[PDB]
Amino acid sequence: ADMEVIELNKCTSGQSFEVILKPPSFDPSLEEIQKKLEAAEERRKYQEAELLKHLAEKREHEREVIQKAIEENNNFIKMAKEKLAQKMESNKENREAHLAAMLERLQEKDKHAEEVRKNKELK
Amino acid sequence: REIVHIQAGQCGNQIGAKFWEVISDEHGIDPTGSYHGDSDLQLERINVYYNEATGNKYVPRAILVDLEPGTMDSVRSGPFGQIFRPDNFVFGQSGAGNNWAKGHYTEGAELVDSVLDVVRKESESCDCLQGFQLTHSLGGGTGSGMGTLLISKIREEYPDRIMNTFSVMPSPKVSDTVVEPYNATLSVHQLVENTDETYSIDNEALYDICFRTLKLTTPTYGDLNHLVSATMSGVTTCLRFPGQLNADLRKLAVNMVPFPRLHFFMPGFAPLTSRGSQQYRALTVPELTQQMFDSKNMMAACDPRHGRYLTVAAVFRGRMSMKEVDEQMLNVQNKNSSYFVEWIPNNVKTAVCDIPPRGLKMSATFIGNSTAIQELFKRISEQFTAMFRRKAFLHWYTGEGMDEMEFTEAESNMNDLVSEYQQYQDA
Amino acid sequence: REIVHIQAGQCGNQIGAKFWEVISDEHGIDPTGSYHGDSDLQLERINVYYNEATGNKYVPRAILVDLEPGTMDSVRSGPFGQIFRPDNFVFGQSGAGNNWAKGHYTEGAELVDSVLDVVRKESESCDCLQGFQLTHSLGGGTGSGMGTLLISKIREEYPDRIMNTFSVMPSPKVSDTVVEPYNATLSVHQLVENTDETYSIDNEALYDICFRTLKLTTPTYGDLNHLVSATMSGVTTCLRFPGQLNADLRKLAVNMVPFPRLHFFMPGFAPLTSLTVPELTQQMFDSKNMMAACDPRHGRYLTVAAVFRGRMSMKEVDEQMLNVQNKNSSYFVEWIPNNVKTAVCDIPPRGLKMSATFIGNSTAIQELFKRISEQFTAMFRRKAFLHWYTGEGMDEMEFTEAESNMNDLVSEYQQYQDAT
Amino acid sequence: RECISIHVGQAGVQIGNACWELYCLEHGIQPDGQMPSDKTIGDSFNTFFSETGAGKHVPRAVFVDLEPTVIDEVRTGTYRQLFHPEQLITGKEDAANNYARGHYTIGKEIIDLVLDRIRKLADQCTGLQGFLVFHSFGGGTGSGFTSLLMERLSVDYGKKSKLEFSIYPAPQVSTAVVEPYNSILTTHTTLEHSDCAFMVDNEAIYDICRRNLDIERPTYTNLNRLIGQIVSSITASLRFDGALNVDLTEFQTNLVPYPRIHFPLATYAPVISAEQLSVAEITNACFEPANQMVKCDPRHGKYMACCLLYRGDVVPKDVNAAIATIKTKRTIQFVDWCPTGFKVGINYQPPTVVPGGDLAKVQRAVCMLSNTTAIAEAWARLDHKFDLMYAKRAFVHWYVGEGMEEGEFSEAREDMAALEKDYEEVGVD
Amino acid sequence: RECISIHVGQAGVQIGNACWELYCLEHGIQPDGQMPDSFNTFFSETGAGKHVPRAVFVDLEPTVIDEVRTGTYRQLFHPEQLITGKEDAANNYARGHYTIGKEIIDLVLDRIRKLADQCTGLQGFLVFHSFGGGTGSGFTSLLMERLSVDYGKKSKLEFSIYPAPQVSTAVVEPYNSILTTHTTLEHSDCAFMVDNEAIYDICRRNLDIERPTYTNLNRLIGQIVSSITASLRFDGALNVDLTEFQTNLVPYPRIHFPLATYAPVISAEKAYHEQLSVAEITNACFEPANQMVKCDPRHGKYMACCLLYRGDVVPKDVNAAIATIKTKRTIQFVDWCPTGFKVGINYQPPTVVPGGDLAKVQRAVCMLSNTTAIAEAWARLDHKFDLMYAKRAFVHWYVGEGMEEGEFSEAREDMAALEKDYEEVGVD
Numbered sequence A: 001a002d003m004e005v006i007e008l009n010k011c012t013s014g015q016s017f018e019v020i021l022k023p024p025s026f027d028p029s030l031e032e033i034q035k036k037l038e039a040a041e042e043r044r045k046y047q048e049a050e051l052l053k054h055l056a057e058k059r060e061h062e063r064e065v066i067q068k069a070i071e072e073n074n075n076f077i078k079m080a081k082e083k084l085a086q087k088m089e090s091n092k093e094n095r096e097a098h099l100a101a102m103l104e105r106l107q108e109k110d111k112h113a114e115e116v117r118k119n120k121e122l123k
Numbered sequence B: 001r002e003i004v005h006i007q008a009g010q011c012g013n014q015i016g017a018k019f020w021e022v023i024s025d026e027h028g029i030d031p032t033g034s035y036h037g038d039s040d041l042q043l044e045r046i047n048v049y050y051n052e053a054t055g056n057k058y059v060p061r062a063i064l065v066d067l068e069p070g071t072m073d074s075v076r077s078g079p080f081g082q083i084f085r086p087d088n089f090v091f092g093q094s095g096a097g098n099n100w101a102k103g104h105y106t107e108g109a110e111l112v113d114s115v116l117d118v119v120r121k122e123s124e125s126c127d128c129l130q131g132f133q134l135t136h137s138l139g140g141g142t143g144s145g146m147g148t149l150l151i152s153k154i155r156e157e158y159p160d161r162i163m164n165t166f167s168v169m170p171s172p173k174v175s176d177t178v179v180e181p182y183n184a185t186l187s188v189h190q191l192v193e194n195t196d197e198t199y200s201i202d203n204e205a206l207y208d209i210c211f212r213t214l215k216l217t218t219p220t221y222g223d224l225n226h227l228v229s230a231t232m233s234g235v236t237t238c239l240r241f242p243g244q245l246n247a248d249l250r251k252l253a254v255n256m257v258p259f260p261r262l263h264f265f266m267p268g269f270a271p272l273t274s275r276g277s278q279q280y281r282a283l284t285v286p287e288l289t290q291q292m293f294d295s296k297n298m299m300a301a302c303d304p305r306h307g308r309y310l311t312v313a314a315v316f317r318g319r320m321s322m323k324e325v326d327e328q329m330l331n332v333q334n335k336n337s338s339y340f341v342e343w344i345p346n347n348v349k350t351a352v353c354d355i356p357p358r359g360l361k362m363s364a365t366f367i368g369n370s371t372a373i374q375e376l377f378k379r380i381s382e383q384f385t386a387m388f389r390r391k392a393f394l395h396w397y398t399g400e401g402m403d404e405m406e407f408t409e410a411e412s413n414m415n416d417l418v419s420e421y422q423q424y425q426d427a
Numbered sequence C: 001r002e003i004v005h006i007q008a009g010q011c012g013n014q015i016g017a018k019f020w021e022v023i024s025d026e027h028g029i030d031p032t033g034s035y036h037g038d039s040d041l042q043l044e045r046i047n048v049y050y051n052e053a054t055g056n057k058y059v060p061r062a063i064l065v066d067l068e069p070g071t072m073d074s075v076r077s078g079p080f081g082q083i084f085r086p087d088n089f090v091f092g093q094s095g096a097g098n099n100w101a102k103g104h105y106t107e108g109a110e111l112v113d114s115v116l117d118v119v120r121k122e123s124e125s126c127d128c129l130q131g132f133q134l135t136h137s138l139g140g141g142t143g144s145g146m147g148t149l150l151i152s153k154i155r156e157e158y159p160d161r162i163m164n165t166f167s168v169m170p171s172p173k174v175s176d177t178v179v180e181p182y183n184a185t186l187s188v189h190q191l192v193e194n195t196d197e198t199y200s201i202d203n204e205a206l207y208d209i210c211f212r213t214l215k216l217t218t219p220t221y222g223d224l225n226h227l228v229s230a231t232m233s234g235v236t237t238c239l240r241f242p243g244q245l246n247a248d249l250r251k252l253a254v255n256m257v258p259f260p261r262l263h264f265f266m267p268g269f270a271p272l273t274s275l276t277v278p279e280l281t282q283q284m285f286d287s288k289n290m291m292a293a294c295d296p297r298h299g300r301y302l303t304v305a306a307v308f309r310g311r312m313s314m315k316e317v318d319e320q321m322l323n324v325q326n327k328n329s330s331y332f333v334e335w336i337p338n339n340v341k342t343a344v345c346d347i348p349p350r351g352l353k354m355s356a357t358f359i360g361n362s363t364a365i366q367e368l369f370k371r372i373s374e375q376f377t378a379m380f381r382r383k384a385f386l387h388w389y390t391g392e393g394m395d396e397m398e399f400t401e402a403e404s405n406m407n408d409l410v411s412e413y414q415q416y417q418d419a420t
Numbered sequence D: 001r002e003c004i005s006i007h008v009g010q011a012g013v014q015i016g017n018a019c020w021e022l023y024c025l026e027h028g029i030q031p032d033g034q035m036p037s038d039k040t041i042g043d044s045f046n047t048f049f050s051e052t053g054a055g056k057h058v059p060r061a062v063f064v065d066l067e068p069t070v071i072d073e074v075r076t077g078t079y080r081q082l083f084h085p086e087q088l089i090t091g092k093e094d095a096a097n098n099y100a101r102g103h104y105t106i107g108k109e110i111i112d113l114v115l116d117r118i119r120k121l122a123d124q125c126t127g128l129q130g131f132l133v134f135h136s137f138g139g140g141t142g143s144g145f146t147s148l149l150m151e152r153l154s155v156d157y158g159k160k161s162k163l164e165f166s167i168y169p170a171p172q173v174s175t176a177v178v179e180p181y182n183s184i185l186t187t188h189t190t191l192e193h194s195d196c197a198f199m200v201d202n203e204a205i206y207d208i209c210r211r212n213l214d215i216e217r218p219t220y221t222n223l224n225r226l227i228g229q230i231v232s233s234i235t236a237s238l239r240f241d242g243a244l245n246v247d248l249t250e251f252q253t254n255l256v257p258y259p260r261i262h263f264p265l266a267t268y269a270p271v272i273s274a275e276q277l278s279v280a281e282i283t284n285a286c287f288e289p290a291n292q293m294v295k296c297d298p299r300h301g302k303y304m305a306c307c308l309l310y311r312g313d314v315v316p317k318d319v320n321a322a323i324a325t326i327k328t329k330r331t332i333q334f335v336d337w338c339p340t341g342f343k344v345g346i347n348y349q350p351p352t353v354v355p356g357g358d359l360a361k362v363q364r365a366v367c368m369l370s371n372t373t374a375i376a377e378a379w380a381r382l383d384h385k386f387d388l389m390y391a392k393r394a395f396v397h398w399y400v401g402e403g404m405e406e407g408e409f410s411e412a413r414e415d416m417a418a419l420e421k422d423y424e425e426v427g428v429d
Numbered sequence E: 001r002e003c004i005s006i007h008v009g010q011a012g013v014q015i016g017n018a019c020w021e022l023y024c025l026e027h028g029i030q031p032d033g034q035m036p037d038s039f040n041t042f043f044s045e046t047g048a049g050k051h052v053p054r055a056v057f058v059d060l061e062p063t064v065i066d067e068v069r070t071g072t073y074r075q076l077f078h079p080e081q082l083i084t085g086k087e088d089a090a091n092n093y094a095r096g097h098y099t100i101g102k103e104i105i106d107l108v109l110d111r112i113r114k115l116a117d118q119c120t121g122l123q124g125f126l127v128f129h130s131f132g133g134g135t136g137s138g139f140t141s142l143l144m145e146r147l148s149v150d151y152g153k154k155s156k157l158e159f160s161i162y163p164a165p166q167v168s169t170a171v172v173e174p175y176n177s178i179l180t181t182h183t184t185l186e187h188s189d190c191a192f193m194v195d196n197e198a199i200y201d202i203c204r205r206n207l208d209i210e211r212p213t214y215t216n217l218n219r220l221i222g223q224i225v226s227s228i229t230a231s232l233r234f235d236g237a238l239n240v241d242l243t244e245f246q247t248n249l250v251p252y253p254r255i256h257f258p259l260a261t262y263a264p265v266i267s268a269e270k271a272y273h274e275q276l277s278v279a280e281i282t283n284a285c286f287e288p289a290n291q292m293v294k295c296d297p298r299h300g301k302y303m304a305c306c307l308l309y310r311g312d313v314v315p316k317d318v319n320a321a322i323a324t325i326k327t328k329r330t331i332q333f334v335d336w337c338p339t340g341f342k343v344g345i346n347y348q349p350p351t352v353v354p355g356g357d358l359a360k361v362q363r364a365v366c367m368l369s370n371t372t373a374i375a376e377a378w379a380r381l382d383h384k385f386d387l388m389y390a391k392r393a394f395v396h397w398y399v400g401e402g403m404e405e406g407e408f409s410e411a412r413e414d415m416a417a418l419e420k421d422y423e424e425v426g427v428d
């Protein structure tokens, strides 16, 4: 606005100067934080070693499924290895005495036929 | 798989004779030698009824038991005489008596073991013996007495294998002996616990089929054996022939027998006569079916009316179409639908083998578990109790070595069988 | 920086086959040997998808897993056959079943360790492995079952590195197995906690893109693989080519995924089968051109990335890119600010002058999850074909334990139709 | 991978003999065993045959019967050349139309041998899949040995699935009254040791021939040719390697939703007599009670899993639109809770028929394997006879005879009752 | 006296590489380092021949630092002064500060200590870095905290690249800037922001470049920076030393952010038009177009003003030109500070990169104003941040690497409070 300057220096390769126009009119870094950086590591090493113990989980549950199947399979084989030869040695004994029931009725039409000739050779 | 044949008693034997020569014809066997015939099947299933010996030769698997020479040298002297192996003949020498006891107790057990000895041979030789069959009279000792003993002694030895008989229920009319009722009831008893199937053949029938249905005046034991000879070929065929059944004998039984007592197939036949009577070709399939289903053509004297068929087999003979057979078969199940039982479902099955008998181009044979058989049983038990009345002829069994109670003890066992067949007009 | 590839299952593998020969083309590699092409770029970022071996030679960083020989000898016998290193083939011999459990539990864990073994020795060789990608079916066991197992076993070993899959969501129409809904729901679960991004590819889409959009009557598993093969080259390019992106794979993920579940980019493509820029752009933003069976209209987009291809004026490209964001303005969320970024590389594909590919994280994807969970409860209903797993040693409740996981993933996708 | 056939019982064996014959025509093997294709040392058809020796191609089969007779007529008529004298076990005495005999009395003895001669054939196989058991429902060794086998095979062989082809028995061409008992017996012991089981109703087959083949009163070897064809269209998938249905699980993972419910209903497409049809028309036959495979009516039972097994010259382009109007014309008929089916299996191999047989060479044939709830119609139509007999102890004594238990009968009907129930319990919601 | 440059992060490094290039041209140093007091302010007369920059270059991938040990200039630095680090920061602060930072920081910090040791009376540091984006925000933040500890008075000047949607790629941007800018601001002294969008803008209007490159933008920032640092390289009165930089520009500890404006950007191809008048270029400095941060200072109050002139100029001119910047344009001064205009004449004619985009000019001007409108962009960032965090938006990636849900809250908090101080300097 047409002002007057205050010359503030002249050296080899320059010159400065203020150019005041219309007067103004009056109106702790801390080192201890390196432990902050291994609290950051406090919470990573927690999270990662937990999506490790949540995962070293889905693992030996797989132990089950895998084998609590196998284990539930021979649960059948060695149920029906005797649902057989124990239902079938109840058979062997079951007939075998329906044969004897057959025959001891014979020695009885037979040890009856014998004693009534001892009754003929006496009449 | 293989069957032996026991054939004991004048009545048993003279049936057995006629049987053998008729089946021996079908297969074609010289009175001695081997095959002579332009057919070729025959021999598939000849295995079953003929154990074959050295040279050509074919010899029946037969045992002939009698309690006196007489009738053994009838066969050996008659038709197909020297066909049977010489020491398959088990001689008697002694009395027979026309008495059950002699045959079942004294003079029978006297022999018996020598019979068991041939049978043991043949069957122990027989590569897979399936069972025995037997033929014999029921009124008269050597057949009905020895045989019922045989069978009892046959089992026990052979529990195992299935038993089977054509037995000739005796009538008051056309018989020799006053006592037969006694003889009958005593074996009837024996049978009903030891056989697996028993073809009931009444001589009341057999004779009636000749005068009612033949105009045959003087009916022999000849033309009359003739029927049985035929009917027996009938029943046997499909264990001994085609390859359209296959007929285990056991299978054959299982599917025929509901209840382990009551195996009393009264049988029947298609055509008939022998002498100066014919057939004007006219055996038709229809006229062949409503004929093995007419009572007046039944091998026992029942009347498969009052009383209902448990099971019913029929086998058909003659290069004819079975496209008609089942259709006719059905027809009768509808036409006489009433008198089958419901509770065993498909209880009348039939099959067909196409090679006819001596003479006759077409033919049907009927096996038949009718409770109307109760008719037959009740007929003998009927005249028996009229004799055990004030105990007549019994003193021949009294002193022989039999008890008083014993008659009643098996007179009873029959009375039960009676009202079990009656207790099978069911629901 | 370097990526290995796991390619498991008949569906997984026959995709992996087509992928590899198409990308192998772009770089130019003989069915065996080395470079043959007048281009020169190629080889900058060939480092990334090919671990190179002695002589000339280039060999993919590939592992091929199956639970039966059959489909392995298809590749080795087919197109770019003996390109892959002979013992990168992990054989199966056994059943697969078209059953998740077998692949994830019994016959799967039976192998697995031999797979981990190749992967360990490719990735342990790989000078700075940045992550794995995997291809596979979701309805059917050897892919969806073993793979979901693989990835679980792949993490844990490699937490560290980012995981990534093209998974093929099975449809009711054009499928082999009654059960697939079961197989899908079981892996969807698995995925949603172990992958970092997951390209959803519906065969309901893939097939539809051929019949409403291509007049080819009898669509094979061939011309249909062909799409995926293409779309897969599309998505990859700028980790494997220019130098105008640079695409850490992690960076790539961080800027694509807002919320750690829900990484479900339904993709899309430009032209089709065996192009102006406008007409190209209002084509990768049509649904009749999305890879998942959705309709990115019921569901606004979370974030959206597209790579364009062709020596063309991108002075036109953001001039049309903006345009979609304005003529379709309501359908991007506002609460993520510059949520549709794009870039352009100019080396075109097998044939084709101009092309573009579209990754899109749309909550409209909720529509595909709902759809599978829909024929699922309808089945788990009276505990249906379930007995095939019952008996494999799985749990009754373990099914409902994963049916639910999905009904939240539905209703969080639902929950991100929010407010400013 | 591999695949052993067991045929027990007269019916089993003859069905067998009449489809190993048809396999043989299909893969071009001259009776003596040698085939002049370049396809052997020791893939593709190796599922069923084994490249034993340098020339021959033996079936991986074992044949058991308890008489000789039937097994006998294999080592007779050419093919006599095809097997190994080992693989045919015969057993001297019959089962006599009775289960008890087959399972306990006569079975006992031969089972140990069979079981082991099977083990020989499983050993010349690297990754055996399962077994095909062909056997007669009713009837003796057929029900009773088969029952014992399975119990046992179930023990000796783990996962190894078991597929049975039962011949559900039919009054008109049977001879045996006791039938029902035997089927309801085995079918009970058998069903928890089986995986999927095709029934074949003799009556329905007899039916097809009287209608569709103009045969007056058809033979066994009449019926067997027909079943021969059907089985060969079911097993087709695993023999040529099929573009679908290619392994025993994802073959049947398809059909059986529930452990118990095995029994699919088959339907063969163009049965037409020598001395052709549209892709559409034959599909529209599979849903015709006449052409069925078990006498029932599925228009009123609900479908709960549907397969369509195509064989011959077909583009899927056709199969589709034909299906489309099976839904807009006929009876849809689906259950409450399973998609609306139609796994569709295309096999380009044109269907070969037995040379001087009854049927003609066709261009295309269809096969439809549906698991309907109406196939339990024949579960009662059997049940009822059994019921109405046992009610009087009818034939029981023959069983209690050989060695059985009055209550083992009770306890088997008990099972059908309960099954007849599950099959009813799958309707609507 | 002396003066070290640290350039962290891809953007930083490239801005660096394109201005060490331009220092080089200006002081006539052939790439190899040999050139046939004064400018010792930046280079060190190491060995007998070469003229190494007193710089250290850090990035977390190689890639970018890698380009330097490739293209001539490969001869200019010491293999030591370029630190690379194997894995990326991935567009995320957390990663930069805490996870990947941790590891390399100890090395960098020390390789810097090498360069400060070959200096007798070191002044301060120039930290060039990207505002948004990963290592750029995170490492720089960790550096400063630490540099703040290892170096006492020793002032720190930052050149931030305030990030812009059009040429970015990263959505997560705002988070990262608001993050760093919080931790960073109490450890910094005066900080020149450079709004990418504004530079992109100049090139689209003033250079006729269709869609301008990074190395398009960098040449331009290269020019501006070299006009700001000019003062301390030639030693010409005004801003002789880093202390002064603040003493003139920052009246308040917090308020660092001055707005730069470069004068005659005109494109060769136009290199022969009767070039601009001492007047006209002054009358450009006050043109929102030619700004350096997208805002509008016609409505915010100025609170300290500097005019940095370079070239052929007698002050006689400067004056009357300023005179009618007053009596024509918007004065716009604060309640309580003179009416500015410290004016810096440097006789050294401005050199431009040879086959570059701009032309050799006779005079150029530079205007460093500390306006209160430059907090327009403090909110235009803030808003995105706000509207994202409101939905936890991308947060989990951070809580992921190790951070705190609340450290985010607490950083917006600071802007909220700053946005406030910047408002609280208007009138009375």
Ligand SMILES: Nc1nc2c(ncn2[C@@H]2O[C@H](COP(=O)(O)OP(=O)(O)OP(=O)(O)O)[C@@H](O)[C@H]2O)c(=O)[nH]1
Pocket (backbone or CB within 6 Å): D008, D009, D010, D011, D012, D014, D015, D065, D066, D067, D094, D095, D096, D097, D098, D136, D137, D138, D139, D140, D141, D142, D143, D167, D168, D169, D170, D173, D174, D175, D202, D220, D221, D223, D224, D227
């Ligand atoms: N479909 C069909 N069924 C048959 C055939 N042969 C017999 N059958 C049936 O088989 C069922 C009875 O089983 P069988 O095999 O005959 O008797 P098995 O005891 O198992 O065998 P064997 O008693 O030794 O002959 C009946 O329903 C007959 O209809 C045949 O060739 N085809």
Ligand SMILES: Nc1nc2c(ncn2[C@@H]2O[C@H](COP(=O)(O)OP(=O)(O)OP(=O)(O)O)[C@@H](O)[C@H]2O)c(=O)[nH]1
Pocket (backbone or CB within 6 Å): E008, E009, E010, E011, E012, E014, E015, E059, E060, E061, E088, E089, E090, E091, E130, E131, E132, E133, E134, E135, E136, E137, E161, E162, E163, E164, E167, E168, E169, E170, E196, E214, E215, E217, E218
């Ligand atoms: N002006 C300018 N801005 C850049 C440049 N490179 C990246 N940017 C911007 O900086 C922000 C991204 O910062 P980057 O430096 O790429 O991130 P960084 O972590 O420091 O570098 P990286 O090691 O690649 O992660 C975005 O706003 C980009 O626009 C560049 O060369 N010049």
Ligand SMILES: Nc1nc2c(ncn2[C@@H]2O[C@H](COP(=O)(O)OP(=O)(O)O)[C@@H](O)[C@H]2O)c(=O)[nH]1
Pocket (backbone or CB within 6 Å): B008, B009, B010, B011, B012, B014, B015, B096, B097, B098, B099, B137, B138, B139, B140, B141, B142, B143, B144, B168, B170, B171, B174, B175, B176, B177, B180, B203, B206, B221, B222, B224, B225, B228
């Ligand atoms: N059809 C047939 N029955 C006969 C024959 N001979 C006798 N019968 C009848 O059968 C009964 C018993 O036969 P019989 O031989 O006297 O008994 P045996 O003591 O065993 O000889 C006789 O009473 C007759 O009624 C015969 O030739 N054939």
Ligand SMILES: Nc1nc2c(ncn2[C@@H]2O[C@H](COP(=O)(O)OP(=O)(O)O)[C@@H](O)[C@H]2O)c(=O)[nH]1
Pocket (backbone or CB within 6 Å): C008, C009, C010, C011, C012, C014, C015, C096, C098, C099, C137, C138, C139, C140, C141, C142, C143, C144, C168, C169, C170, C171, C174, C175, C176, C180, C203, C206, C221, C224, C225, C228
């Ligand atoms: N597009 C693509 N999908 C396929 C292919 N083969 C099968 N699928 C689909 O993937 C699902 C089953 O995949 P599949 O490979 O059979 O299962 P797996 O072998 O056990 O992994 C089904 O829904 C099919 O629709 C193919 O090769 N390409």
Ligand SMILES: CCOC(=O)Nc1cc2c(c(N)n1)N=C(c1ccccc1)[C@H](C)N2
Pocket (backbone or CB within 6 Å): B003, B132, B133, B164, B197, B234, B235, B236, B238, B239, B245, B247, B249, B252, B253, B256, B313, B314, B315, B349, B350, B351, B367, D175
């Ligand atoms: C020696 C054994 O032979 C006999 O003495 N008696 C015998 C003969 C039978 C018979 C049976 N049960 N017993 N069953 C038959 C049947 C009829 C139709 C279908 C199937 C079989 C036919 C009549 N043949």
Ligand SMILES: CCOC(=O)Nc1cc2c(c(N)n1)N=C(c1ccccc1)[C@H](C)N2
Pocket (backbone or CB within 6 Å): C003, C132, C133, C164, C165, C197, C234, C235, C236, C238, C239, C247, C249, C252, C253, C256, C305, C306, C307, C341, C342, C343, C359, E169
């Ligand atoms: C294995 C590598 O391929 C992947 O599996 N995943 C992958 C690839 C991306 C991608 C992303 N998010 N994920 N983002 C992209 C993008 C496009 C424009 C601007 C910035 C990025 C481009 C498409 N490439």
Ligand SMILES: [Mg+2]
Pocket (backbone or CB within 6 Å): C010, C098, C140
């Ligand atoms: Mg498959």
